[PDB]
mmCIF file of all heavy atoms in Angstrom:
data_model
loop_
_atom_site.group_PDB
_atom_site.id
_atom_site.type_symbol
_atom_site.label_atom_id
_atom_site.label_comp_id
_atom_site.label_asym_id
_atom_site.label_seq_id
_atom_site.Cartn_x
_atom_site.Cartn_y
_atom_site.Cartn_z
ATOM 1 N N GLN I 28 -27.064 6.903 -9.826
ATOM 2 C CA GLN I 28 -27.949 8.003 -10.001
ATOM 3 C C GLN I 28 -27.962 8.400 -11.476
ATOM 4 O O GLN I 28 -29.027 8.801 -12.084
ATOM 5 C CB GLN I 28 -27.550 9.175 -9.040
ATOM 6 C CG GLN I 28 -28.201 10.508 -9.466
ATOM 7 C CD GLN I 28 -27.423 11.302 -10.584
ATOM 8 O OE1 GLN I 28 -28.011 12.166 -11.210
ATOM 9 N NE2 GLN I 28 -26.173 10.995 -10.667
ATOM 10 N N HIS I 29 -26.766 8.469 -12.047
ATOM 11 C CA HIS I 29 -26.577 8.841 -13.490
ATOM 12 C C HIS I 29 -27.227 7.857 -14.479
ATOM 13 O O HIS I 29 -27.863 8.374 -15.397
ATOM 14 C CB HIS I 29 -25.085 8.953 -13.777
ATOM 15 C CG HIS I 29 -24.784 9.296 -15.176
ATOM 16 N ND1 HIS I 29 -24.825 10.626 -15.635
ATOM 17 C CD2 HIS I 29 -24.605 8.610 -16.309
ATOM 18 C CE1 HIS I 29 -24.577 10.647 -16.926
ATOM 19 N NE2 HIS I 29 -24.446 9.448 -17.333
ATOM 20 N N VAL I 30 -27.062 6.540 -14.217
ATOM 21 C CA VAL I 30 -27.599 5.608 -15.119
ATOM 22 C C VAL I 30 -29.161 5.669 -15.037
ATOM 23 O O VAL I 30 -29.822 5.459 -16.017
ATOM 24 C CB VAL I 30 -27.143 4.117 -14.701
ATOM 25 C CG1 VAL I 30 -27.898 3.154 -15.538
ATOM 26 C CG2 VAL I 30 -25.718 4.042 -14.934
ATOM 27 N N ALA I 31 -29.688 5.916 -13.793
ATOM 28 C CA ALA I 31 -31.112 6.020 -13.667
ATOM 29 C C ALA I 31 -31.635 7.334 -14.374
ATOM 30 O O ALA I 31 -32.778 7.221 -14.984
ATOM 31 C CB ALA I 31 -31.432 6.096 -12.193
ATOM 32 N N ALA I 32 -30.902 8.435 -14.275
ATOM 33 C CA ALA I 32 -31.299 9.621 -14.884
ATOM 34 C C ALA I 32 -31.352 9.633 -16.416
ATOM 35 O O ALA I 32 -32.308 10.218 -16.985
ATOM 36 C CB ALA I 32 -30.414 10.743 -14.447
ATOM 37 N N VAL I 33 -30.369 9.015 -17.014
ATOM 38 C CA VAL I 33 -30.304 8.985 -18.488
ATOM 39 C C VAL I 33 -30.611 7.685 -19.128
ATOM 40 O O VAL I 33 -30.570 7.610 -20.421
ATOM 41 C CB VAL I 33 -28.919 9.577 -18.951
ATOM 42 C CG1 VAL I 33 -28.674 10.848 -18.327
ATOM 43 C CG2 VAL I 33 -27.888 8.490 -18.709
ATOM 44 N N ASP I 34 -30.726 6.606 -18.423
ATOM 45 C CA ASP I 34 -30.932 5.281 -19.071
ATOM 46 C C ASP I 34 -31.590 4.359 -17.988
ATOM 47 O O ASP I 34 -30.900 3.291 -17.657
ATOM 48 C CB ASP I 34 -29.615 4.749 -19.580
ATOM 49 C CG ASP I 34 -29.826 3.526 -20.389
ATOM 50 O OD1 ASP I 34 -30.978 3.282 -20.899
ATOM 51 O OD2 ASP I 34 -28.815 2.758 -20.680
ATOM 52 N N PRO I 35 -32.754 4.630 -17.432
ATOM 53 C CA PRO I 35 -33.578 3.966 -16.564
ATOM 54 C C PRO I 35 -33.643 2.459 -16.785
ATOM 55 O O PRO I 35 -33.854 1.691 -15.847
ATOM 56 C CB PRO I 35 -34.824 4.715 -16.424
ATOM 57 C CG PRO I 35 -34.968 5.244 -17.759
ATOM 58 C CD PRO I 35 -33.567 5.757 -18.057
ATOM 59 N N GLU I 36 -33.641 2.055 -18.031
ATOM 60 C CA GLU I 36 -33.818 0.590 -18.418
ATOM 61 C C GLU I 36 -32.666 -0.204 -17.775
ATOM 62 O O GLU I 36 -32.938 -1.284 -17.285
ATOM 63 C CB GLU I 36 -33.789 0.494 -19.939
ATOM 64 N N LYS I 37 -31.475 0.273 -17.862
ATOM 65 C CA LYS I 37 -30.269 -0.416 -17.381
ATOM 66 C C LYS I 37 -29.971 -0.198 -15.861
ATOM 67 O O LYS I 37 -29.082 -0.803 -15.324
ATOM 68 C CB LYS I 37 -29.040 0.025 -18.158
ATOM 69 C CG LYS I 37 -29.094 -0.356 -19.647
ATOM 70 N N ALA I 38 -30.679 0.708 -15.259
ATOM 71 C CA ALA I 38 -30.561 0.939 -13.863
ATOM 72 C C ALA I 38 -30.909 -0.213 -12.990
ATOM 73 O O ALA I 38 -30.227 -0.587 -12.054
ATOM 74 C CB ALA I 38 -31.285 2.160 -13.462
ATOM 75 N N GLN I 39 -31.977 -0.931 -13.316
ATOM 76 C CA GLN I 39 -32.450 -2.080 -12.612
ATOM 77 C C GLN I 39 -31.421 -3.196 -12.474
ATOM 78 O O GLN I 39 -31.426 -3.929 -11.444
ATOM 79 C CB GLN I 39 -33.752 -2.627 -13.344
ATOM 80 C CG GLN I 39 -34.070 -4.132 -12.804
ATOM 81 C CD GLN I 39 -35.464 -4.400 -13.035
ATOM 82 O OE1 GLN I 39 -36.174 -3.975 -13.956
ATOM 83 N NE2 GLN I 39 -36.054 -5.266 -12.111
ATOM 84 N N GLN I 40 -30.492 -3.315 -13.442
ATOM 85 C CA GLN I 40 -29.442 -4.386 -13.337
ATOM 86 C C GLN I 40 -28.317 -3.961 -12.407
ATOM 87 O O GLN I 40 -27.497 -4.795 -12.093
ATOM 88 C CB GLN I 40 -28.972 -4.576 -14.750
ATOM 89 C CG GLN I 40 -29.980 -5.291 -15.732
ATOM 90 N N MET I 41 -28.272 -2.770 -11.946
ATOM 91 C CA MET I 41 -27.232 -2.261 -11.118
ATOM 92 C C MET I 41 -27.572 -2.309 -9.599
ATOM 93 O O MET I 41 -26.702 -2.249 -8.723
ATOM 94 C CB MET I 41 -26.864 -0.776 -11.405
ATOM 95 C CG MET I 41 -26.300 -0.560 -12.710
ATOM 96 S SD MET I 41 -26.201 1.193 -12.956
ATOM 97 C CE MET I 41 -25.264 1.555 -11.595
ATOM 98 N N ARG I 42 -28.898 -2.441 -9.219
ATOM 99 C CA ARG I 42 -29.370 -2.449 -7.885
ATOM 100 C C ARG I 42 -28.431 -3.310 -6.902
ATOM 101 O O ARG I 42 -28.016 -2.832 -5.907
ATOM 102 C CB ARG I 42 -30.779 -2.931 -7.881
ATOM 103 C CG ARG I 42 -31.811 -1.957 -8.539
ATOM 104 C CD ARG I 42 -33.218 -2.438 -8.454
ATOM 105 N NE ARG I 42 -34.049 -1.730 -9.335
ATOM 106 C CZ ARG I 42 -35.268 -2.090 -9.780
ATOM 107 N NH1 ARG I 42 -35.768 -3.225 -9.227
ATOM 108 N NH2 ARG I 42 -35.947 -1.390 -10.583
ATOM 109 N N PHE I 43 -28.321 -4.655 -7.210
ATOM 110 C CA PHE I 43 -27.567 -5.534 -6.436
ATOM 111 C C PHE I 43 -26.131 -5.152 -6.248
ATOM 112 O O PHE I 43 -25.526 -5.309 -5.233
ATOM 113 C CB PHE I 43 -27.717 -7.014 -7.012
ATOM 114 C CG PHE I 43 -29.054 -7.593 -6.514
ATOM 115 C CD1 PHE I 43 -30.022 -7.903 -7.380
ATOM 116 C CD2 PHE I 43 -29.270 -7.881 -5.112
ATOM 117 C CE1 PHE I 43 -31.267 -8.476 -6.990
ATOM 118 C CE2 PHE I 43 -30.459 -8.428 -4.694
ATOM 119 C CZ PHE I 43 -31.479 -8.747 -5.616
ATOM 120 N N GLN I 44 -25.492 -4.722 -7.382
ATOM 121 C CA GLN I 44 -24.072 -4.390 -7.422
ATOM 122 C C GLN I 44 -23.849 -3.115 -6.403
ATOM 123 O O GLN I 44 -22.815 -3.145 -5.692
ATOM 124 C CB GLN I 44 -23.577 -4.084 -8.731
ATOM 125 C CG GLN I 44 -23.748 -5.279 -9.645
ATOM 126 C CD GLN I 44 -23.091 -5.014 -11.041
ATOM 127 O OE1 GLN I 44 -22.158 -5.460 -11.543
ATOM 128 N NE2 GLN I 44 -23.906 -4.188 -11.787
ATOM 129 N N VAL I 45 -24.713 -2.167 -6.501
ATOM 130 C CA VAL I 45 -24.561 -0.982 -5.732
ATOM 131 C C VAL I 45 -24.680 -1.317 -4.263
ATOM 132 O O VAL I 45 -23.963 -0.853 -3.424
ATOM 133 C CB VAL I 45 -25.543 0.157 -6.111
ATOM 134 C CG1 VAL I 45 -25.364 1.359 -5.177
ATOM 135 C CG2 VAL I 45 -25.325 0.573 -7.543
ATOM 136 N N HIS I 46 -25.689 -2.171 -4.014
ATOM 137 C CA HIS I 46 -26.043 -2.610 -2.651
ATOM 138 C C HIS I 46 -24.840 -3.247 -2.055
ATOM 139 O O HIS I 46 -24.473 -2.983 -0.912
ATOM 140 C CB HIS I 46 -27.203 -3.534 -2.769
ATOM 141 C CG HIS I 46 -27.841 -4.061 -1.371
ATOM 142 N ND1 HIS I 46 -28.000 -3.219 -0.412
ATOM 143 C CD2 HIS I 46 -28.097 -5.236 -0.954
ATOM 144 C CE1 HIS I 46 -28.409 -3.855 0.662
ATOM 145 N NE2 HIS I 46 -28.497 -5.151 0.336
ATOM 146 N N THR I 47 -24.298 -4.249 -2.793
ATOM 147 C CA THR I 47 -23.110 -5.009 -2.363
ATOM 148 C C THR I 47 -21.849 -4.040 -2.155
ATOM 149 O O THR I 47 -21.208 -4.135 -1.130
ATOM 150 C CB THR I 47 -22.762 -6.015 -3.401
ATOM 151 O OG1 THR I 47 -23.777 -7.053 -3.425
ATOM 152 C CG2 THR I 47 -21.471 -6.696 -3.137
ATOM 153 N N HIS I 48 -21.573 -3.195 -3.193
ATOM 154 C CA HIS I 48 -20.408 -2.355 -3.103
ATOM 155 C C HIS I 48 -20.515 -1.419 -1.847
ATOM 156 O O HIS I 48 -19.451 -1.165 -1.202
ATOM 157 C CB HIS I 48 -20.204 -1.576 -4.450
ATOM 158 C CG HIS I 48 -18.953 -0.915 -4.510
ATOM 159 N ND1 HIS I 48 -18.463 -0.200 -5.543
ATOM 160 C CD2 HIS I 48 -17.855 -0.858 -3.654
ATOM 161 C CE1 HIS I 48 -17.251 0.246 -5.398
ATOM 162 N NE2 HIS I 48 -16.837 -0.098 -4.238
ATOM 163 N N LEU I 49 -21.664 -0.892 -1.678
ATOM 164 C CA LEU I 49 -21.850 0.062 -0.464
ATOM 165 C C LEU I 49 -21.544 -0.667 0.805
ATOM 166 O O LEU I 49 -20.998 -0.117 1.738
ATOM 167 C CB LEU I 49 -23.299 0.652 -0.526
ATOM 168 C CG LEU I 49 -23.550 1.624 -1.675
ATOM 169 C CD1 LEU I 49 -25.001 2.056 -1.707
ATOM 170 C CD2 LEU I 49 -22.588 2.869 -1.450
ATOM 171 N N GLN I 50 -21.974 -1.936 0.889
ATOM 172 C CA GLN I 50 -21.666 -2.735 2.166
ATOM 173 C C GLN I 50 -20.204 -3.125 2.236
ATOM 174 O O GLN I 50 -19.652 -3.121 3.320
ATOM 175 C CB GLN I 50 -22.559 -3.938 2.243
ATOM 176 C CG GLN I 50 -24.020 -3.751 2.524
ATOM 177 C CD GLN I 50 -24.757 -4.994 2.649
ATOM 178 O OE1 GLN I 50 -24.890 -5.821 1.683
ATOM 179 N NE2 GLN I 50 -25.424 -5.248 3.771
ATOM 180 N N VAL I 51 -19.533 -3.207 1.104
ATOM 181 C CA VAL I 51 -18.162 -3.534 1.118
ATOM 182 C C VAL I 51 -17.412 -2.300 1.739
ATOM 183 O O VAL I 51 -16.538 -2.468 2.623
ATOM 184 C CB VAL I 51 -17.613 -3.824 -0.319
ATOM 185 C CG1 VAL I 51 -16.086 -3.798 -0.217
ATOM 186 C CG2 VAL I 51 -18.095 -5.121 -0.785
ATOM 187 N N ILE I 52 -17.791 -1.105 1.303
ATOM 188 C CA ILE I 52 -17.161 0.064 1.784
ATOM 189 C C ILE I 52 -17.377 0.296 3.269
ATOM 190 O O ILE I 52 -16.427 0.710 3.943
ATOM 191 C CB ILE I 52 -17.706 1.274 0.953
ATOM 192 C CG1 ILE I 52 -17.399 1.164 -0.449
ATOM 193 C CG2 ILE I 52 -17.226 2.572 1.576
ATOM 194 C CD1 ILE I 52 -17.945 2.192 -1.327
ATOM 195 N N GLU I 53 -18.560 0.068 3.730
ATOM 196 C CA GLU I 53 -18.869 0.237 5.171
ATOM 197 C C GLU I 53 -18.029 -0.781 5.969
ATOM 198 O O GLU I 53 -17.459 -0.379 7.005
ATOM 199 C CB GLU I 53 -20.344 -0.057 5.420
ATOM 200 C CG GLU I 53 -20.749 0.223 6.874
ATOM 201 N N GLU I 54 -17.929 -1.995 5.581
ATOM 202 C CA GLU I 54 -17.171 -3.032 6.198
ATOM 203 C C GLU I 54 -15.652 -2.675 6.255
ATOM 204 O O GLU I 54 -15.029 -2.978 7.229
ATOM 205 C CB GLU I 54 -17.357 -4.409 5.580
ATOM 206 C CG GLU I 54 -16.629 -5.507 6.176
ATOM 207 N N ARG I 55 -15.196 -2.055 5.222
ATOM 208 C CA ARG I 55 -13.757 -1.600 5.236
ATOM 209 C C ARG I 55 -13.517 -0.570 6.153
ATOM 210 O O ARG I 55 -12.469 -0.571 6.876
ATOM 211 C CB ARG I 55 -13.358 -1.192 3.780
ATOM 212 C CG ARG I 55 -12.906 -2.286 2.831
ATOM 213 C CD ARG I 55 -11.971 -1.706 1.823
ATOM 214 N NE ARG I 55 -12.560 -0.570 1.038
ATOM 215 C CZ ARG I 55 -12.979 -0.660 -0.147
ATOM 216 N NH1 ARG I 55 -12.898 -1.852 -0.819
ATOM 217 N NH2 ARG I 55 -13.523 0.351 -0.762
ATOM 218 N N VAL I 56 -14.458 0.338 6.272
ATOM 219 C CA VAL I 56 -14.299 1.416 7.288
ATOM 220 C C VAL I 56 -14.238 0.895 8.712
ATOM 221 O O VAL I 56 -13.567 1.336 9.527
ATOM 222 C CB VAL I 56 -15.441 2.397 7.146
ATOM 223 C CG1 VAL I 56 -15.535 3.385 8.318
ATOM 224 C CG2 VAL I 56 -15.264 3.226 5.857
ATOM 225 N N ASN I 57 -15.081 -0.092 8.989
ATOM 226 C CA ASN I 57 -15.181 -0.730 10.283
ATOM 227 C C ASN I 57 -13.888 -1.482 10.577
ATOM 228 O O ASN I 57 -13.395 -1.474 11.710
ATOM 229 C CB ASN I 57 -16.411 -1.606 10.498
ATOM 230 C CG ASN I 57 -17.655 -0.782 10.470
ATOM 231 O OD1 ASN I 57 -17.684 0.424 10.833
ATOM 232 N ND2 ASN I 57 -18.757 -1.471 10.008
ATOM 233 N N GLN I 58 -13.378 -2.155 9.634
ATOM 234 C CA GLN I 58 -12.155 -2.950 9.815
ATOM 235 C C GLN I 58 -10.948 -1.963 10.153
ATOM 236 O O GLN I 58 -10.181 -2.290 11.071
ATOM 237 C CB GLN I 58 -11.796 -3.792 8.603
ATOM 238 C CG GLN I 58 -12.549 -5.091 8.476
ATOM 239 C CD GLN I 58 -12.508 -5.947 9.833
ATOM 240 O OE1 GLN I 58 -11.442 -6.272 10.321
ATOM 241 N NE2 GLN I 58 -13.671 -6.258 10.340
ATOM 242 N N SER I 59 -10.894 -0.885 9.492
ATOM 243 C CA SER I 59 -9.857 0.088 9.677
ATOM 244 C C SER I 59 -9.859 0.719 11.011
ATOM 245 O O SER I 59 -8.827 0.903 11.689
ATOM 246 C CB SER I 59 -9.873 1.149 8.569
ATOM 247 O OG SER I 59 -9.591 0.516 7.295
#
């Protein structure tokens, strides 16, 4: 959200990483 707010040009390169990290977190919660 921060990168998009102050530097939208570089936000596009984060899409996949955020998508992936968010699924990692959900998967960890389910394993626990």
